[PDB]
C-alpha cells in the first residue's frame, strides 16, 4: 500500500531559474527512490536513483536528496531541454510492489498572452454525412488555463463538446486549444446563432465569436 | 553391461538409477578409476577427468533417484567404459564415439567422387552404410566412396554406423551442379 | 556426567545415527535464521517437464550466531563416548564410558575447512570410510588451530608459516596412511559448484566464497608472512540443505569482519590405476554430514532399559 | 549498454489476450532484470511487474497479479508480457525496461529496482470498435467576419480507429504555425482531432493549402485542400 505523491502538479518556472520538485511517501522508503523525466511521445528517462545518485549522462544541474518519506528533485539552471514531466518511484518493499508518483509537469513560465479565437462552422461536405461539427480555436495563449462555453441561441450548451490542448510551444511557449461542438444534421439546422464564449487572463472581458447558421 | 553410441560433437547422456527416490551419494569414474563427476550432499563436483568442463549432470532428477552423466561436445577420446557407483553398486557402461565426414567439399560436379570417412576409437569394428537421396547406398568398413556422382545425389545423405549390434545416424548434406548444353 | 566402563564397544562414525540428527537439526536452525528473499527447489514429478517450486518471503538482514549445542540421550537410549585420545570411528574402543550429553558442539556450515571445532589431543588425525576409495572424503583433524581472518572487503588472511607447518603435518600423516616413499601433492579443487570449489561459509550473515588455490598448491618429500585469499560475497547461491537455489539481500554493513580457527580439513584424492609413486589431494566438502561427523566421531547412541 | 526493441502496436477486443515482446541486445541478457510499465493516454506511469531474468522468477502488482504474466527466453534475449481478459481500461502504451544487477551469472545480484534502459514502448488499444479510416473535413478560413491580417484554417479528422494518425500540410512543405491537436475519443468510441494553421490572409486565393492525413491501420491516405469559400 505504499503510495508516492508529487506536490507540484505543475511547476511554472522561468528559463534559467531553478526548480524544486517534491515527492512524499505514505510510508518510509529509506533511500530506494528514483526520479524520471518524460518528454511527450518518448520513453521515460532515469535521472536519479538511490535518492541522490545521478545516472550516467545526467547533467550536474540535476540533483536529488532526502530520505524516508520526503524527497526533492532540484534542477539548478533550467535549460530549454529540461521542459518535461517528472515522476518519482519507490522500490523499497519486498516482495516487489513498486509504485510511481502521479508526476509533476514542469512548464515554461512566460508573460500572459491572450488567445486568438476563431470559429469554424460545419463544412458543407460534413452536413452531407448527417452530422455538424462546430470548431472553436483559441490560438497561442498563456497560461494554459482557459475556459470555453458554447452558446447556441443564447443557450449554454454542455455535454456535446470536447476540448483538446496542444503541448507547450517550443518556440513561443504558448498553448493552443481546440473545442469541438458536435450535433446531428437535425439539431444544427434547427438553430440560428452559434457562439463560442472564451475566458482567459490576458483578455479583459470574455471574447465571444459566433456565426449565424446560413 | 550396456553399450551406448554417440556422435562426435553431440551430447550424450548416461543414466544411472538408484533403488529409492532419495537424493543419495554417487559419482562416475572411467576405466582407470579416474573421477569424472559426482555429488557431495546437494552440491556437484568434478574430477581431474579429461572431460571436466564438458561433463555435467541434472540435479533436477537427484530427488527422483536419477544421477545421469551428460557429456557434451563429444570427442573420440571420450570413448571408454564408465562406472556409476551409487548406494554400493556399479552400473557399468561402455561408450563409443563416432564421427563421419566427407573428404571433399559439398560443392561437387556431376561425375566426381564422394568419400565419406568415419572416425572410430581404437579397438572397434563398426559397419558403415550411407544412403543417397535417389537411393544410392554404399557400405564400408572405415571409408565409403562413390566413384561417379549423379545429379540426383544432391541432397541429404543418411548414414548408419553399426557397432555392438547398435546404431547411430549421420546426416551429411551434399551438392552437385547441374550444368547445361 | 561421566562413568568409566570396563568393556570393548564397537563404533562407526560412518553409520552414526546422531549425525543425521544433527544434520536435520542444523538444517532447521538455519531455515529459521537465514531466510532468503526467494528459494528455488527442483520438482520433476515425471509429469513431462520439470516444475520448479518458488518462494518469495521476507528477507530480514541477520547474521547466523552459532550457539553451542549439547546432544543428550534420546528417550530410551544412552550415549557412549570413546575416551581414547586417538580413535577413528570405524573400529573397537576398549576405553569407553557412558555420558549424559555430548560436549558443546559449535555448528558451522562451511566447505574444505572446518572452523571452531574440536582439536586432536595427540597428533593430527585423518579419517575415511575407505582411504582406498578415491571418491571418499578424508576428514583431517588438526592438533593445533590456525587462525583465518576474513573481511567483507574481499579477502581472508592466513599465516603463511603456520599453514606451511600444518601441511607438513597433514602430508606426514598422509604418507603414513598411504606410502612412505610416496609423494604428497596438494592441488586446487578439480571443479564443480562454487560453494565446493572455494572455501564457502557465512560471515556476518553473508555468504563468502574465497579462492583457496593458494592454500593447496604444494609438494612434499621430494618477504614471507601472511597469505591473502580473494573472497566474494554472493547473493545467489546453491542451497546445502538440499538441491536448490537461494537469493539473499545485498550487504548493509560496510564492515563485515570474522575470525575463525581452522581446526579440520575435508580432502579428496585423485584416482588412477597403478600410476606412479605419488598422491594428489584437493579441498573437499559439500556434505555437511562430514562436518557434523568430524565432531561426533567419538559418540554413539545406544538402546537401554 | 543493452537496447530495448519492442514489438509493434496491438489492437484487441475486450476479453482478448495480448502478448508483447521486447528484444534486448548489447550485453549479457542474464546479467539484467526486466520490468514492464504501462501508461494510459494522459496519465502517469504504472508499475506492472518485474522478472529476475537469472532466477526466472517474476513478481507482479496486486491489481494485476493473476491475469498478468511476464517471461523471458534466455535463448533469444527476449522478454514477454502477457495480459489476459483484456479490458477497455487496459488501453495504454506498454513500456519494457531493464537494469544491470551485477554478475548474476556469478552470484552477484544487487536486486536493483530503478529502471535505466527503456524501450520505444508498445501501444495496445483495447476496444469494441473496428478498424476504420477517418473522413477529413475542411475548416475554411475565418475571412468572413473577423478583420485582421492572419487567417486561420485547417482540417477536421473525424471518426477513425484506432490511433494513431499523422497530419501535415503541403506534403510537408508547410510546418510553421501549424497545430495538430491531440486526438480525443468520442462517445461513439471513434477518435477525432483537428489540425490547424494561421496563415496570412493575403496568402489566400493565391497559395493553396492542403492537409495530408495518413492512417496506416486502415491504410487510408487522404489529401484535402481548404479554399476560402
Ligand atoms: C587475525 O587477527 C588475530 C588477532 O585478532 C584478534 O581478534 C580480533 C577480532 C580482535 O578482537 C583482536 O583484538 C584480537 O587480537 C591475529 O592473531 C592473526 O594474526 C590475524 N590473522 C592473520 C593475518 O594471521
Ligand atoms: C608419474 O607421472 C606420469 C603419470 O601421471 C600423470 O602425469 C601427467 C601426465 C598428468 O597430466 C596426469 O595425467 C598424471 O598424473 C607417468 O608418465 C610418469 O612416468 C610417472 N613419473 C613421473 C615422471 O612423475
Ligand atoms: C507445478 O507442478 C506441480 C506438481 O507436479 C503441480 O501440482 C502444479 O499444478 C504445477 N503448476 C503449479 C501450480 O506450480
Ligand atoms: C581405526 O580404523 C582402523 C581401520 O580398520 C582399525 O583397524 C582400528 O581399530 C580403528 N581404531 C583406531 C586404532 O584408531
Ligand atoms: C601434533 O602436534 C604435536 C605438538 O602439539 C606435534 O609434535 C605433532 O607432530 C603433531 N602431529 C603430527 C605427528 O603431525
Ligand atoms: C574400499 O575401497 C575399495 C577401493 O575403491 C573398494 O572396494 C570400495 O571403495 C571399498 N570397499 C569396502 C569393502 O569398503
Ligand atoms: C615451509 O616454510 C617456508 C615458509 O616460510 C616455505 O618456503 C617452505 O616451502 C616450507 N618448508 C617446509 C618443507 O616445511
Ligand atoms: C583463484 O581461483 C580461480 C578459480 O576460482 C582460479 O582460476 C585462479 O587461478 C585462482 N587464483 C588464485 C588467487 O590463486
Ligand atoms: C602454486 O602455489 C603458490 C603458493 O605457494 C601460488 O601462489 C600459486 O598460484 C600456485 N600455482 C599456480 C600459479 O596456480
Ligand atoms: C581461536 O581463534 C581466535 C580468533 O577468532 C583467536 O583469538 C584464538 O587465539 C584462537 N584460539 C586458539 C584455539 O588458540
Ligand atoms: C567461531 O567461528 C565463527 C565463524 O563461524 C566466528 O564468527 C566466531 O567469532 C568464532 N567464535 C569465537 C570463539 O571467536
Ligand atoms: C575388565 O578388566 C578388569 C580388570 O580389573 C576385569 O576385572 C573385568 O572382568 C574386565 N571386564 C570384563 C570384560 O568382564
Ligand atoms: C585407541 O588408541 C589407544 C592408544 O592410543 C589404544 O590403546 C586403543 O586400543 C585404541 N582404541 C581403543 C579405545 O581401544
Ligand atoms: C580409560 O582407561 C585407561 C586404562 O586404564 C586409562 O589410561 C585412561 O585414562 C581412561 N580414559 C579416561 C580419561 O576415562
Coordinates of N, CA, C and O in Angstrom, one line a residue, chain D residues 168-175 210-212 221 223:
Chain D
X168 N -0.3 16.7 -41.8 CA 0.7 17.6 -42.2 C 0.1 18.5 -43.3 O -1.0 18.3 -43.8
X169 N 0.9 19.5 -43.7 CA 0.4 20.4 -44.8 C 1.4 20.5 -45.9 O 2.6 20.4 -45.8
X170 N 0.8 20.7 -47.1 CA 1.6 20.8 -48.4 C 2.7 19.8 -48.5 O 3.8 20.1 -48.7
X171 N 2.3 18.5 -48.4 CA 3.3 17.4 -48.5 C 4.5 17.6 -47.6 O 5.5 17.0 -47.8
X172 N 4.3 18.4 -46.5 CA 5.3 18.7 -45.6 C 6.2 19.9 -45.9 O 7.2 20.1 -45.3
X173 N 5.6 20.7 -46.8 CA 6.4 22.0 -47.1 C 6.0 23.0 -46.1 O 6.8 24.0 -45.9
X174 N 4.8 22.9 -45.6 CA 4.4 23.9 -44.6 C 4.3 23.3 -43.2 O 3.8 22.2 -43.0
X175 N 5.0 23.9 -42.2 CA 5.0 23.4 -40.9 C 4.9 24.5 -39.9 O 4.7 24.3 -38.7
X210 N -3.1 22.4 -48.3 CA -3.6 21.1 -48.4 C -3.1 20.3 -47.2 O -1.8 20.1 -47.0
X211 N -4.0 19.7 -46.4 CA -3.6 18.8 -45.3 C -3.5 17.4 -45.8 O -4.4 16.9 -46.5
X212 N -2.5 16.7 -45.4 CA -2.3 15.3 -45.7 C -2.5 14.5 -44.5 O -1.9 14.6 -43.5
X221 N -5.1 7.1 -46.9 CA -4.2 8.3 -47.1 C -5.1 9.3 -47.8 O -5.6 9.1 -48.9
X223 N -6.0 13.5 -48.8 CA -5.5 14.8 -49.2 C -6.7 15.8 -49.4 O -7.5 15.5 -50.3

